[PDB]
Amino acid sequence: MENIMTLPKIKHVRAWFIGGATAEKGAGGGDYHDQGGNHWIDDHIATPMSKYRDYEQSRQSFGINVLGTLIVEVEAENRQTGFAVSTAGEMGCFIVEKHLNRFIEGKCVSDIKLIHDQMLGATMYYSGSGGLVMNTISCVDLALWDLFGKVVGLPVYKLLGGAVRDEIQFYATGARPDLAKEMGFIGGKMPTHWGPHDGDAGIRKDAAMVADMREKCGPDFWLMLDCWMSQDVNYATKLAHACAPFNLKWIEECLPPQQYEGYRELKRNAPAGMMVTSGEHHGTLQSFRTLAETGIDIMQPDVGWCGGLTTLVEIAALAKSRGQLVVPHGSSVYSHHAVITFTNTPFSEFLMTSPDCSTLRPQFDPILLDEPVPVNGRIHKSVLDKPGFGVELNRDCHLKRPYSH
Amino acid sequence: MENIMTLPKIKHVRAWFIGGATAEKGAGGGDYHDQGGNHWIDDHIATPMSKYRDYEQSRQSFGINVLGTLIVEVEAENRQTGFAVSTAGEMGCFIVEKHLNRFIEGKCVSDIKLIHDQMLGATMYYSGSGGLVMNTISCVDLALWDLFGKVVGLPVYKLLGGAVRDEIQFYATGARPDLAKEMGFIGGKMPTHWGPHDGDAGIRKDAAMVADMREKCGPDFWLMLDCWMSQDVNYATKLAHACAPFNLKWIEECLPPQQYEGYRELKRNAPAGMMVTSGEHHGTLQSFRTLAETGIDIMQPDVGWCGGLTTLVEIAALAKSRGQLVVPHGSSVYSHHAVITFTNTPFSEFLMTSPDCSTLRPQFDPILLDEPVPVNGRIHKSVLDKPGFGVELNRDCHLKRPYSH
Ligand SMILES: [Mg+2]
Ligand SMILES: [Mg+2]
């Protein structure tokens, strides 16, 4: 047998940020919510805060955009680099530059699972099993998979064991599922605009929105509702049944992430055939074990928030063992390379960054160079035939380096 | 009827930090683990990372001290101030100065619960239901109660409904239960030094440690083991049974926080009469509802990490409704003013900050001025008869202000 391919050790790990409270508002990039004005993503979307007068109209108003984008780049001894982006910004930089770097630098580019376990174990006392800290860990994990793939000379999806489908089909998230159908997507997930404090009126309004789109889009085009942790079991139940006549495919994240018991009850009260989903805000494999056992149909971890690709692959296995499906939240290429290899992820999500959901603005525009976008609502595997996650970092953005070591 | 007392509005909220990766290592204060060398609290304590040779001997080596102390001060328009400290440091300052301030400033000093709900709601998307972000929220909540109490001119314990006992009795956490007994404490909790990877030898060594202290302390002085999230169900079960002959009162935090199912199984497997506890790393009332339902005997939230006093009071009610006890983790005065009013908190914890557990070094030395300490292992209620939480900020410490607004 021939000697194996030689691998360089990791020399440096650096972190930068754009957008957020300490940079330029509306920088976009990794933080899906760091947008400008008049964006659908900030137009009266129901949240745990919309019950408050001052925070009902805009999520930006309560600070859904304060973190911004975290960018993590790992440089190997041979000068090759790998990178990834997520939501964490400046604080994420502190965590990477002042803590996690000790487990990263000096390791082989292939020591990905090891670095991952050490990051999880070393931050367990302050990570809260999700959120900001987990987004940061996820970003490092992704940058490591990117570097490894680029060093080896292969797309992440091939390293994982190959594609199980020639193309990825997408459903689009935004306020215009009708426009989305035009573009070739297989469905449209709309956000709810009213919550529990609005009562029966709120239910009629969002349900009427679903009815209208069903009329506009036809019966074969999927329709879903994203509730962004804004409801309670009773309201979610009433909304689900009110939308049942229009064949709503699923009702997503009705409750805050900790309310597992509530998800179990909501799922059992759901209209026959209608799915209940959640997961984008959960983190760590164990949390998904608890979520999976509530009986919900589909878990939706965000690859950059759940713990990274390493964790995502484990969650997929968890779901498959129960004969269920896993459909990641956004994530662009970080999801593509993963889900294209999952037999239990028959479709993916494309979150409209376009202010009016009329064009195919890239998922992480503009931080990612050469970022692929659905063509006729799909991305063929050949589009991913590039090293690592196949993209480069847009240094034209005004990246900031708040910390160093 | 007389006119109610005049209450000022909150004008400014400010955040500072000491210690941590960006300041002086070993600053102490809010971060119990930000200590110097030769400290019992860093002496081969078992952790989720001690299975790694490089991180077995010292928790500081894996970064248990990177955060340091967060200090939050709220100033009212009548120039009075209220403050609190916690573990979060520089990042905590970012969250307070760049996000939470919008919900704090302009409110009445009595709008504590309102500000609390808004902080939880606006950070739900990145808080992870615990850890760093929750620690920050908790610090703000405590600063608000401190200010409200100082404005009203009453100790927090009286505002809460009065003391239900004349004195708080403490058990001491550290390597010297024997010295703790001489000091007047009612019990001594020791940290385990070995983990699952150590197998039967590990169990024998820590069980021998307990046996030794049982011989030195007598049968009525309580003995407990703290496992700091370092085990799995099987190892914890074996250790518990190995210590049963010495009447170990309880075995604490054997598992990482997300492992509720494991806690349920561990409690079921525990020796008759021996208690299983956890909770210091959990956050939000909902997580405690889930934790409570696993059947563990005592939940141990840290007032500065669980969500604050506002949240601690709710957890106490939750436990009380189940006929169970709540014994907070450390917290000094922030716990004292609350627990002295809880019928179901018969005793409290004093975590040794003295390097060798031989003296009564203040719980949060040296950030808190006039910080009370147990006398004969107790703190009489009269010691708490000062406004708010009864202490002042030690400005002699080199406080840093990384952000402003
Ligand atoms: Mg969603
Ligand atoms: Mg403990």
CA-atom Rg of chain B in angstroms: 20
Distance separating alpha carbons of residues B30 and B173, to the nearest angstrom: 17
The residue written with tokens 């390493």 in the block is: A310
Contact A63/B122, CB-based, under 8 Å? Answer: yes
Residues B314, B200: one domain? yes
Measured torsion, CA atoms of residues A395, A396, A398, A401, in degrees rounded to the nearest 10? 10
Distances (CA, A) of B176 to A90, A371, B243, B277, B314: 41, 59, 18, 21, 33
Among chain B residues, CA nearest to A65: B99
Question: What phi and psi, each to the nearest 5 degrees, are found at residue B99?
Answer: -135, -70
The residue written with tokens 């956004």 in the block is: A330
**Beta pairing partners, A82:** A74
Contact B124/A403, CB-based, under 8 Å? Answer: no
Residues A162, A225: one domain? yes
Neighbouring CB atoms inside 10 A of B78's CB total 12
| SS3 call for B222 | strand
Residue B59 annotated as binding site: yes
Q: Return the structure tokens found at B375.
A: 């006398």
Distance from residue B301's CA to the centre of ligand 2 (Å): 10
Residues B136, B160: one domain? no
Candidate from A67, A126, A261 with C-beta closest to B126? A67
Distance from residue B187's CA to the centre of ligand 2 (Å): 14
Q: Which of A170, A172, A220 is nearest to A356 (CA)?
A: A172
Q: Return the structure tokens found at B46.
A: 């078992």
Residues B116, B170: one domain? no
Residue B252 annotated as binding site: yes
Q: Return the structure tokens found at A289.
A: 């074990």
In sequence order, the 6+-apart residues with CB closer than 8 A to the CB of B363 are B330, B331, B332, B350, B351, B353, B371, B373
Distance separating alpha carbons of residues A316 and A339, to the nearest angstrom: 9
**Beta pairing partners, A404:** none
Contact B132/A134, CB-based, under 8 Å? Answer: no
How many residues in total does chain A contain?
Answer: 405
Residues B176, B52: one domain? no
Distance separating alpha carbons of residues B83 and B159, to the nearest angstrom: 17
Among chain B residues, CA nearest to A62: B122
Contact B258/A284, CB-based, under 8 Å? Answer: yes
Distance separating alpha carbons of residues B397 and B391, to the nearest angstrom: 15
Q: How far is B266 from chain A (nearest CA, A)?
A: 16
Distance from residue B189's CA to the centre of ligand 2 (Å): 9
Q: Return the structure tokens found at A30.
A: 């990794």
From first CA to last CA, the distance across chain B in angstroms is 42
Helices and strands of chain B, counted as H and E runs: 13, 14
Which ligand is the nearest neighbour of the Cα of B252? 2
Residue burial B137-171, b: 16+ Cβ < 10 Å; e: rest:
bbbbbbbbbbbbbbbbebbbbbbbeebeeebbbbb
Q: How far is B229 from chain A (nearest CA, A)?
A: 9
- The answer to whether A343 and A325 are in contact (CB under 8 A) is no
Residue burial A92-109, b: 16+ Cβ < 10 Å; e: rest:
bbbbbbbbbbbbbbebeb
Whether the link from the prior residue into B372 is cis, omega within 30° of 0, is: no
Indicate the number of domains in chain B: 2
Q: Is the dihedral of CA A116, A122, A127, A133 positive or negative?
A: negative
Distance separating alpha carbons of residues B165 and B162, to the nearest angstrom: 9
Contact B256/A130, CB-based, under 8 Å? Answer: no
Residues B5, B29: one domain? yes
Question: What phi and psi, each to the nearest 5 degrees, are found at residue A82?
Answer: -140, 150
Chain B partners of A41 at a C-beta cutoff of 8 Å?
A: none
Distance separating alpha carbons of residues B205 and A227, to the nearest angstrom: 52
Residue A293 annotated as binding site: no
Distance separating alpha carbons of residues A225 and A208, to the nearest angstrom: 12
- The answer to whether A28 and A332 are in contact (CB under 8 A) is no
E strand or H helix at B311, and its extent? helix B309-321
Residue A395 annotated as binding site: no
**Beta pairing partners, B169:** B378
Q: Which of B59, B25, B394, B368 is nearest to B230 (CA)?
A: B59
The secondary structure of B333-399 as a DSSP string is HHHHHHHTT-TT---EEEE--STTS-S---TTTTTEET----BTTEEEGGGG-SSBTS-EE-TTS--
CATH number of the domain within which A145 lies = 3.30.390.10
Candidate from B49, B64, B98 with C-beta closest to A66? B98
Residues A41, A144: one domain? yes
Residues B126, B192: one domain? no
Q: How far is B48 from chain A (nearest CA, A)?
A: 5
Distance separating alpha carbons of residues B258 and A179, to the nearest angstrom: 41
Per-residue DSSP letter, B6 = P
Residues B172, B142: one domain? no
Give the determination technique. X-ray
Chain B partners of A135 at a C-beta cutoff of 8 Å?
A: 126
Please count the CA atoms within 13 angstroms of the CA of B115 that sit on its side-chain side: 32
Q: Is the dihedral of CA B297, B301, B303, B307 positive or negative?
A: negative
Amino acid at A151: V
Q: How far is B124 from chain A (nearest CA, A)?
A: 8
Q: Which of A133, A101, A145 is nearest to B88 (CA)?
A: A133
E strand or H helix at B17, and its extent? strand B10-18
Measured torsion, CA atoms of residues B353, B298, B311, B329, in degrees rounded to the nearest 10? 0
Cα angle, residue A141 at apex, residues B50 and B65 outer, rounded to 5°: 40
Distance separating alpha carbons of residues B289 and A311, to the nearest angstrom: 26
Neighbouring CB atoms inside 10 A of A234's CB total 12
Cα angle, residue B312 at apex, residues B174 and B29 outer, rounded to 5°: 45
- The answer to whether A353 and A362 are in contact (CB under 8 A) is yes
- The answer to whether A74 and A143 are in contact (CB under 8 A) is yes
- The answer to whether B364 and B392 are in contact (CB under 8 A) is no
Which ligand is the nearest neighbour of the Cα of B282? 2
Q: What is the resolution of this structure in A?
A: 1.8
Chain A partners of B400 at a C-beta cutoff of 8 Å?
A: none
CATH number of the domain within which A176 lies = 3.20.20.120
Distance separating alpha carbons of residues B126 and A130, to the nearest angstrom: 7
Candidate from A63, A128, A403 with C-beta closest to B129? A128
Chain A partners of B99 at a C-beta cutoff of 8 Å?
A: 21, 63, 66
What string of H, E and C letters represents the secondary structure of B89-131?
HHHHHHHHHHHHHHHHCCCECCCHHHHHHHHHHHHHHHHCCCC
Residue B302 annotated as binding site: no
Q: Which of A202, A47, A200, A31 is nearest to A55 (CA)?
A: A47
| SS3 call for B251 | strand
How many residues in total does chain B contain?
Answer: 405
| SS3 call for B146 | helix
Distance from residue A302's CA to the centre of ligand 2 (Å): 32
Distance separating alpha carbons of residues A114 and A120, to the nearest angstrom: 10
| SS3 call for B201 | helix
What string of H, E and C letters represents the secondary structure of chain A?
CCCCCCCCEEEEEEEEEECCCCCCCCCCCCCCCCCCCCCHHHCCCCCCCCCCHHHCCCHHHHCCCCCCEEEEEEEECCCCEEEEEEECHHHHHHHHHHHHHHHHCCCECCCHHHHHHHHHHHHHHHHCCCCHHHHHHHHHHHHHHHHHHHHHCCEHHHHCCCCCCCEEEEEEECCCHHHHHHHCCCEEEEECCCCHHHHHHHHHHHHHHHHHHHHHHCCCCEEEEECCCCCCHHHHHHHHHHHHHHCCCEEECCCCCCCHHHHHHHHHHCCCCCEEEECCCCCCHHHHHHHHCCCCCEECCCCCCCCCHHHHHHHHHHHHHCCCEECCCCCCHHHHHHHCCCCCCCCEEEECCCCCCCCCCCCCCCCEECCCCCECCEEEHHHHCCCECCCEECCCCCCECCCCC
Among chain A residues, CA nearest to B46: A121
Residues B401, B370: one domain? no
| SS3 call for B88 | coil
Residue B33 annotated as binding site: yes
Distance separating alpha carbons of residues A70 and A132, to the nearest angstrom: 10
Chain B partners of A127 at a C-beta cutoff of 8 Å?
A: 128, 131-132
Whether the link from the prior residue into B362 is cis, omega within 30° of 0, is: no
Neighbouring CB atoms inside 10 A of A62's CB total 25
**Domain span at A368:** 154-394
Residues B295, B216: one domain? yes
Candidate from A21, A260, A289 with C-beta closest to B290? A260
**Beta pairing partners, B188:** B172, B223
Neighbouring CB atoms inside 10 A of A138's CB total 34
- The answer to whether A251 and A240 are in contact (CB under 8 A) is yes
Residues A146, A242: one domain? no
Candidate from A48, A257, A287 with C-beta closest to B121? A48
A323 burial level (CB within 10 Å; 0-12, 13-18, 19+): exposed
- Among the listed residues B329, B337, B398, B405, the single catalytic one is B329
Q: How far is A238 from chain B (nearest CA, A)?
A: 23
**Beta pairing partners, B82:** B74
Q: Which of A161, A155, A217 is nearest to A185 (CA)?
A: A217
Q: Which of A220, A225, A62 is nearest to B123 (CA)?
A: A62
Contacts from B176-179 at CB under 8 Å and sequence distance 24+? B176/B40, B176/B352, B176/B356, B176/B357, B176/B358, B177/B213, B177/B216, B177/B217, B177/B221, B177/B223, B178/B213, B178/B216, B178/B217, B179/B357, B179/B358
